[PDB]
Design a protein around this nucleic acid. Sequence first.
DNA 1: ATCGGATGTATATATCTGACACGTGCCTGGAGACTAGGGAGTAATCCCCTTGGCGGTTAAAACGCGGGGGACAGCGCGTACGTGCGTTTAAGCGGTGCTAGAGCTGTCTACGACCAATTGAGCGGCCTCGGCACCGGGATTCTCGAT
DNA 2: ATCGAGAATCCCGGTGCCGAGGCCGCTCAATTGGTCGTAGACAGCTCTAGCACCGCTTAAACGCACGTACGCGCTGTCCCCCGCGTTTTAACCGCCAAGGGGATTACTCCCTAGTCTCCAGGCACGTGTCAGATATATACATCCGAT
Lengths: 83, 82, 93, 94, 85, 148, 109, 108, 99, 99
Amino acid sequence: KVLRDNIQGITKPAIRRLARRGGVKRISGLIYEETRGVLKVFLENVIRDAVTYTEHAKRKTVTAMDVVYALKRQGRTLYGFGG
Amino acid sequence: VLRDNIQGITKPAIRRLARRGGVKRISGLIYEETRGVLKVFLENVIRDAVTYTEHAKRKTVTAMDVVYALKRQGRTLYGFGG
Amino acid sequence: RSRKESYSIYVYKVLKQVHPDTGISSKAMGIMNSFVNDIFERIAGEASRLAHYNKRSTITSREIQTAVRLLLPGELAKHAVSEGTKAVTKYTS
Amino acid sequence: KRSRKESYSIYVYKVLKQVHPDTGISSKAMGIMNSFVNDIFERIAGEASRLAHYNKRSTITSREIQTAVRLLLPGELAKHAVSEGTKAVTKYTS
Amino acid sequence: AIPSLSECQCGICMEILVEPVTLPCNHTLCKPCFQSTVEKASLCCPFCRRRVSSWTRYHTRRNSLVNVELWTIIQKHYPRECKLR
Amino acid sequence: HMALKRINKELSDLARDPPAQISAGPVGDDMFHWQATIMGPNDSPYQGGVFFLTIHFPTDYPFKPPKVAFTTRIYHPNINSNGSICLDILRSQWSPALTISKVLLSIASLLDDPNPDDPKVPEIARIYKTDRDKYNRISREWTQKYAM
Amino acid sequence: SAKACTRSSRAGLQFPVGRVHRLLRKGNYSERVGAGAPVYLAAVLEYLTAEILELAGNAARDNKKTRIIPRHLQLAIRNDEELNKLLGRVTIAQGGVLPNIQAVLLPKK
Amino acid sequence: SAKACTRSSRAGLQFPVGRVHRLLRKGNYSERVGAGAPVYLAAVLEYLTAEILELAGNAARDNKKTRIIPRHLQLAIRNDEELNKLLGRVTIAQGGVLPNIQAVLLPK
Amino acid sequence: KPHRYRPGTVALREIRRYQKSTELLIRKLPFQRLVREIAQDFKTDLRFQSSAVMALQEACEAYLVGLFEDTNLCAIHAKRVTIMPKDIQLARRIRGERA
Amino acid sequence: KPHRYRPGTVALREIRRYQKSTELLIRKLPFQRLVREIAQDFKTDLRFQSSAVMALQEACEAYLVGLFEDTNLCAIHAKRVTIMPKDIQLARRIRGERA
DNA sequence: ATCGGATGTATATATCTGACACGTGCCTGGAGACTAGGGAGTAATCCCCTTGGCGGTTAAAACGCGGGGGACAGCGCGTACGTGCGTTTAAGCGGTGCTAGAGCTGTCTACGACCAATTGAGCGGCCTCGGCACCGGGATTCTCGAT
DNA sequence: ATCGAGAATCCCGGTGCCGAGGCCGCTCAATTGGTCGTAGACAGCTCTAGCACCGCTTAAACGCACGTACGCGCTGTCCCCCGCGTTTTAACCGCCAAGGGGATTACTCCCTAGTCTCCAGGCACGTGTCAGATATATACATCCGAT
Ligand SMILES: [Zn+2]
Ligand SMILES: [Zn+2]
């Protein structure tokens, strides 16, 4: 049940919607791959710490609290899911 | 009492910092903006330094207070103890 | 089961003090609880560090006052110190 | 006389005389090294405290410090430091 | 000059030296010995006890541990050893 | 494997050139466990004293130091009653380049000259540091009844 | 005071004082905790909560609703000045963003 | 290992284990402290110290000096991918800056 | 004969529309699959609470919105209205995420 | 007829010189007077240890050098080599200390 | 400058659905009284380091001038991105089934805090000689105008 | 494409000085030995929710054609920083004098931890109802081509 090339699920319309929320009026054609790379790097960085936190507690399910703690450690506090 | 000591940060003293930062050409309006931002930074650091001094019931601002304030703002300094 | 403590009822009481008509949803309560916990941890940690710096072994009201002064911005810090001093003076007598 | 003030200068010099047997060190450099050691000590031992608080424990064991080292240090420094600490603990116990 | 067989050996294996590595102290030893000492030993020099931790981290990343210049010299003279080793 | 080949080379070296006033060999079928006999050095108060000791080889050799233990009961500040020894080369500063001959000769030198900086037993080390006649007497009287 | 009512009622607060005292004592902060620290901490926390709730309620009333939802809290926090700096590095779930468009991007007249 | 000797030598370290244990116990970190935590923490600290000192000595030798000064510490730290990341928000007093001139500014 | 807006009005209309609502903008199943793939890359045979995936999505979307605001300001600084990858690179460099 | 270096060939020489050294570039008495004047607002009749002034000077010089390093990149991104007061503002906004 | 399409957004009305607010039992945490001990407050003493001052010299700041290069504005080309439309894809919703694993309870053993003696590790003060800074002369290498 | 002259920088040798490093004395904190209460490790059990599957709708994604307006290059102007010479200002340094406040020690008292007993406040759980989201039908703001 391995998974491959799923980052293509972050479609171009979704990136356009995110840019529109950010306040962008005209977007170049090479933005999408750069945004995909940035998102992948951020996701890897957060998930690594979440997995470390859930490994220290000898669990197999990653709780929302592990993700909240990882985000807080990275300097991006999140309100809404505990803490 | 002292007044208008910000003019002691002269034009050459800012050009030297710019050259260390790697700037080849400087416009003439850079100096006043640099003085303003430097004054803001100094006020921000010295406020916490003075707060640390006042809490400890002292009349002198030790280097430990400056180090603690810099670490509090996220500018950890190595060399003056701590 | 399990008993989980929270600041929900106190937040609701303060809200009813401020806005007697408006209610509040559940996600807003989760956000307020998170905010209260975060501010508690910030102030307590700063006070503990302050007590450690001066080679003390206790946390009095002046440590909390200095931590509040260090954390909160100007007007917020002044008003918070005013409210804290008022509460301490009212409680001690 | 002045009161006793502890430091890591002796141990830092002992370590320095291992990698480079024929190199000295200045006073300011030793102060910077002492500050670095203190800062890293505080970082690791403060991360381990919260890591133990999360799981509702009262003891700080080598497991908490190992996970703190994993969380703090970068990709390869963490691996090397974890290996060094595991070797040290194994040599200490037996 | 061309070294003799007796004077090109690793102190650990005591057998013929293969894939030499030269530490910053210039002590030479065959790569399997270094790989084994990194895992279990004190990561120092087996001969004079000088720390090479940064050296190891620097060279394993680029896979430049082997002393290529001496490896060819040793390999050309004694190629019949590699089949049995 | 590698450790077995290393032990074979060690025995080949020992057989080719016998060492100085020491002799080690596998007492049993397994080559991992060894027994070694050391004779009293001439420049020491242990003249005419033979000492037997046991050698345990860890599975990961030479990257882990072998464990030596005196079988007999010998009086020395660096040796307990159980037969262990206190040598920095043994465990503190062991390196794969060292051989069993090196550690055996280091033990012999320790017999010639003890270690008072970090003694394993403080009381008998203090006795050594205080006087010599009593130490010499008790060492001789115990080696004349336990060594041989 | 009379030393008879509850601690929160004695101090005139709504946030608990006993719970704050217990959290300070069991939180691994200091070997000792003073008698007046929980009162001061509870007062500060109550003041901050009241301020944020007031601003959020004002925003909700301006939105013609009678319930604070995370959007109203986001509006209240970002539209302020000291509160925006206090929570500069904080993400509110389901909060959205403040509406603004750069003047360059608007159509020409 | 065998007892009846200093704790720093049982683990083969150079940093003190007793001082680290005392600081962990009296640092308001936790109610109890395990007996193996100071060993691991001292090992990590000693490894990091040696890591920085080796590069500092190399930099000092590159400048024909036989004495480490804060400039050499800054040079060693800023030239390493991981040490720079670890000490990223840290300022070294009297350390200067790395030589770096943008290619646009160079004469043509 | 057919009526169509000049290029730019619909962009501003969408900008106004998406700065008013607060829902998520990335489809949930693809993001869940991507998160699961990365986590499986880290540690095999992992399970995910739904709230964990939700929090990850919220954090990623907020980060991307902030990055795009900074990118827009960078693009405007160069006398332009189109955002190009060099603006993203400069914003990440100045913010300190890539150095 | 007398020797004269073309513009820009002496700025580069000073760049190469100042990045090689480590000494402080701002004079000490004016900076001490500035620190004391700034601090006299918060509390009066204060005294300063000799090390505190030097620590403040080191921190301020490092901060200014970093700010100029970012400003140079902002200026180059706009296709010009002169740094202007609209680059410092953009750098400070992106870093987070202006907003 | 509107002139009227034409599109999209804002406004008022019915309805109905689940989340919000409140009532109930209870049990675990908070309050009340008491004792003991050490941590912190206060007073006195010492002396170290910070403040203030004066004179000299000279390195660095300030002022001015000639001009060359860089910032800014204006035109033009063409191509890349926006907008609208028809086709195809897989997200989203609902419902069912199963079991892996988180959460909880009960025993009990081994690890860690506490206390007393005691002595060697490490801190403070001294002293000396070598590494590094400085000065003077020469060689090397960018730099620029002119052919 | 070049040769040469003014100029800044690097190498090398000799002199001096001050601080890095090693030694000696000693006080105190880390080590050894023993005791005891309790944290957490392990085993068994429950039942929650995370994973997997299936069918239908229609919403969002995708591919495409047309066109226009924005990015990028080129040319020109002018003015504003830069490099260099000369004059004025005060930073830096060495010296002397004083006293303010940091640092330490002795004594005492009162404030907080620890223990036991008791009861009520907040938490888990259940239920009624209305705030708001959705569907439908007008009404106004805005854009666009062009007189
Ligand atoms: Zn070998
Ligand atoms: Zn070597």
